[PDB]
Structure formats: C-alpha cells, structure tokens
C-alpha cells in the first residue's frame, strides 16, 4: 500500500515538533504573567484570554474557565489535558 510504501521508505515522521507549542508568543512565564492567582496560573503555563476567567495553555492550546474554589491551576490543567507536552514534560520548541 502507498501507506506501507511511505513507512518502509521511512518517510513517515511525527511533526508534533512543528505544531507545538501552539503559541510561541506565550512561551515565557513572564510573557505569561503579563496579560485566580496570576503567579500560579502562569506557572502552570496558562495565560489569560481577556474573557471572564478563561485562560489558555501556550503549549497545547487548551482552554480552562469557570474556576471553582480549591481548583489548583496545574492539577486542572492535566486533568483536562493529560496529553499536553507541558503537562507531560515533553520537550517544547
């Protein structure tokens, strides 16, 4: 199969390294802390979107909002995006 062809010839490659982080601009924590404990969220790689209490991850691009008391940034981040590089520890940029 064309598919089998592409594989045997080693043309198939994981391009995650060109898709993530979804937002290079919010790569840095400081850049994050720029635009819910700020110092905490930013530390979980989440940056504010300007709407309600809705933040987004620079890595996966996931969105979190409507934070309830007791919600620790980082814990929520991986609960909803357990496959996120930042969450996983996979290299970024």
């Amino acid at each position: 199969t064309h598919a089998d062809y592409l594989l045997r010839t080693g043309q198939v490659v994981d391009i995650s390294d060109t898709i993530y982080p979804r937002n290079p601009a919010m790569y840095s924590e400081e850049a994050r802390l720029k635009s819910l404990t700020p110092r905490e969220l930013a530390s979980a790689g989440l940056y504010y979107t300007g709407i309600g209490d809705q933040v987004q991850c620079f890595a996966c691009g996931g969105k979190l909002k409507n934070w309830e008391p007791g919600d620790r940034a980082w814990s929520e981040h991986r609960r909803h995006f357990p496959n996120c590089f930042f969450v996983l520890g996979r290299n970024l940029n």
């Binding site: 598919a3 594989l7 198939v12 490659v13 994981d14 391009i15 995650s16 390294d17 060109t18 898709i19 496959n83 590089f85 996983l88 520890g89 996979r90 290299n91």
Partner: protein
C-alpha cells in the same frame, strides 16, 4: 583430539555481556521528529543526563521506556499515522549491573 581437562577449564558464553537497547519493539516502526531528533535518542540522553550518576543502567533504560511510552504520541495529517505510540525495547544479556559512576 582432546583431553579430559573439562573440569580445569573455565568459560563464559561468547554471546554474553551484550546489551541491545532498541528504540522500538520488534516488528514495529520507530518515530523521528520532523526535525528535532528521535523520540528514543531524545529520551535516552535526557535520562542518561539526569541519572547516569545515580542509577543502574537497566533502571535508566527503564526510565527511557516510560518516558517514550508516556510523553510521546505522533502527529500526522494522515490518519493512518496519527496519534501513534511507541515502546522501546531493552535486550540485556549482561551478567552484572552497570553503573556509570
């Protein structure tokens, strides 16, 4: 011919003391990042860097197995190759433990 000195001659397998650290299970494909190296090597160095001075080799390579198995999943626009995983393969025929420190 030969002599009955079988009990006075000591040998070890010619195939012993070899360790093959494979990046993927037998029969499987092995992934590479578009341009950022390979999943396996990437993890290998990482784990070697952190634990070379405090863990036995098998355990280090077992760390690599988890790293590759846990932190990696492919991304392709072709469904056929998207969201694929990988498990490295440790093939040890070593007789002793190996510490780099």
């Amino acid at each position: 011919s030969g002599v009955d000195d079988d009990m006075a001659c000591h040998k070890i397998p010619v195939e012993a003391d070899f360790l093959y650290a494979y990046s993927t299970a037998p029969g499987y494909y092995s992934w590479r990042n578009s341009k950022d190296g390979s999943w396996f090597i990437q993890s290998l160095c990482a784990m070697l860097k952190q634990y070379a001075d405090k863990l036995e080799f098998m355990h280090i390579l077992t760390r690599v197995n988890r790293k590759v198995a846990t932190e990696f999943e492919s991304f392709s626009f072709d469904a056929t190759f998207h969201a694929k995983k990988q498990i490295p393969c440790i093939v040890s025929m070593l007789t002793k433990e190996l510490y780099f420190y």
